[PDB]
Each structure stands twice: as C-alpha cells, then as structure tokens.
Structure 1
C-alpha cells in the first residue's frame, strides 16, 4: 500500500551505551544494514548514520540517530523533511518494556509510553504519531523507579540472545514491511515464538 521509505533505529551514541537495552532499535537497523550490504554513513545534516538502498525501484533509507535518545526527532525530521517522507512511510524500531526479550511486534501509531526517543519523534514530526513501530521486547524491571537504570543497562546474555532472536523474526518479515503490507507482516511476525 504505502512503501516504507525510512527505517529508524533508536539508541544512544558512544561506547558506554552500545549493547544497552535502550539501543535495541539501533541494533535492529545495524543488523538490517549488514544483511542488506548497506553502508551507514556519518552525515551531520541528518544528525546520524544514514544508509540507502533500492527496493522495487524506490530508495529506502536507514537511519540511526547519533543524537542522544531524547533528541532523536531532530534526526528523523531532518531526513524525512529533506526527502519529503510522510509519517506513514516511516518505520521506527525501538526497545519495548512491555514485552519480554524474544518478542517483537508491529504497531501503527499510538503514544510514546515514556520512551523519550518516540516522544521526540512525535514532537518533531509536527505532533504526528502515525508512523509505524517495530517494538522489540526488553522486559520490565518490575517498578517505575528501576526503569531508567534498566534500559541504560546491559542485559544478561540470555536476554540479549532472546533480543537477537526477535530481531531475526522481524527481518523475516522485511519483505512485507518494505512493501507496507502491515497486515501480513503482523500476521507472520506476531505468530512467531522465541
């Protein structure tokens, strides 16, 4: 229906934040770029790492913002703005507290749920939330006061492997996602068990 033109992977920059839970989305996009043979170029204009490849005669861009997570929108709006990409043609991959490691789901629209990357993107896109999300489960620590330390921490290896597994499931529906066939992507993805 509407082909995806931009896939954004959320995360924080630098070695300290690499491999942390809040970089799950960035990890998805890095894995996707590697599987597709796409180079991610540092591009100051877009405040991140940008990659491009062609699919069905159209350019699809990959973006990992190198802002801190709470300014991710600045990156997304700079790139979407420049190429005139509507929210409906954007997919944002991100960590999801409300699902355990090993689970990925797709969602169109909705709020940010206290995810400051999502929050900034919604604001920067002109208060538009109708982009698609790839929700990568990272589990929840069990109280609101533990969340900040938890998402900025490195998960136990078992949870990381489960995340890797969910990323693979999601890559398995890339054809559907790229085409904008969310119904099919959802049917295939949400039926998978890690």
Structure 2
C-alpha cells in the first residue's frame, strides 16, 4: 500500500567477510538493488547505507548496516524512523543455522535461531514481529562453534551453489514484498 518496506541484508563489513556465511544477507541486498537499478549511498543519521526503489508497487528502502553483526540493530532502528517504517514492515535477510544448506524460507516473527544479528535487531526494535527471509546454511559440524562457523567461508562444494542460492534468496524476497 502506502506503507514503505525496509529490506535489510545482514553482514559484517570488510572484503574478508564478504564471502563468509554471515554475509549472505549482504549479497542478497546487493542483488536486489542491482535488479532495481537503485544504488547505495551513505546515511549519516543511521550509519548504514541505503538504496531506494519500488517493487510490486511498494516503496522500497534497501539497507546494509556498516557496523558489525552484533551491532546491526542499532543502525536499523534509526533507519526505520527516518523512513517511517513500522517494525512489522521490516524485512531482514539472513543466513540461518536452523535451515539446511540452500534451503530458503520466508517468515514473520518468531525466534532468532541463535543468530547474533537478529538478537541485535530484536533488542533494537523491542519486538520480533518483523519479517525474515531465511537462507539456510545448515547446522555447524560438531567441531565448530556456531559463531565461528558463520565467520568462515563456505566449503569448496558449497561455494558452487551460493551464487544460485542468492538469486533464489532475492527471488523469495521479491515474492514476500509482493504478497504483503
């Protein structure tokens, strides 16, 4: 309708994190902005970078915080205000531990799944009733702490699929926006 959506892709800054598991949200957000013809630019009132557009007749504000994952939420809250976006209309794209590799799921409200970005977001919005585009990376092997697992690059085999999984992740996001 008239209410604008804020799509946020979670991730850590710096090239060396660009390919880590905890950066799929970043990649997807880039993908979307590319499809929209919109481009990112600094947002001094939130410390994040935004790109604006229109999908399925809805006004879109794409975003990628520039702080670290554990601080993601502090740039989204001020961002939600600047553009007058209710938490219900916030969509955060993210790698998901509770989902297996390549599996994509739309979801609104619920748990954080052990992801430190989401936790930061909940604590910043004072609610979990925000939308999510979950991109599965499967659970970590017993030999890796979940937090170290996501800060690592995908395996040789996995890397072959990430490109396609992101296009699919972007597609699922477009469908989510289109449905409500």
TM-score (norm 2): 0.90
Secondary structure of 1:16's match?
A: helix
Residue aligning to 2:135:
136
Give how far 1:166 is off.
Answer: 2.4
1:61 Cα deviation after fit: 0.3
Within 1, Cα distance between the matches of 2:158 and 2:87?
A: 31
Residue 7 to residue 161, structure 1, CA distance change in 2 (3 Å):
farther
For residues 63 and 20 of structure 1, do their structure 2 counterparts lie closer, same or farther at Cα, with a shift above 3 Å needed?
Answer: same
Question: Counterparts of 2:47 and 2:82 in 1: how far apart (Å)?
Answer: 13
1:46 is paired with a residue whose SS is coil
Residue 175 of structure 1: how far off its partner (Å): 4.3
Is 1:151 the equivalent of 2:150?
yes
Matched residue SS, 2:128? coil
Q: Name the CA distance, whole Å, in 1 between partners of 2:164 and 2:56.
A: 27
The 2-side partners of 1:136 and 1:23 are apart by 11
Flag the 1:76–1:159 CA change in 2: closer, same or farther, 3 A. Answer: same
Query: Offset of 1:113 from its aligned partner?
Result: 2.1
Q: Point out where structure 1 has 5 or more consecutive residues left out of the alignment.
A: 182-194
Q: Distance in 1 between matches of 2:143 and 2:97?
A: 11
Quickly say closer, same or farther: Cα 1:110–1:4, change in 2 above 3 A: farther
SS at match of 1:112: coil
Q: In structure 1, what is the equivalent of residue 22 of structure 2?
A: 22
| Offset, 1:170 | 3.0
Per mean C-alpha deviation after superposition, the further-off stretch among 143-152 and 3-12 is 143-152
Sort the Cα spacing of 1:89 and 1:152 in 2 relative to 1 into closer, same or farther, 3 A.
same
Q: CA RMSD in A?
A: 2.1
Size of the aligned set, in residue pairs, is 180
Kept in 1, the 8 Å contact 2:4–2:58? The answer is no
- Secondary structure of the residue aligned to 1:12 is coil
Change (3 A) 1:4 1:138: farther
**2:106–2:176 contact (8 Å) kept in structure 1:** no
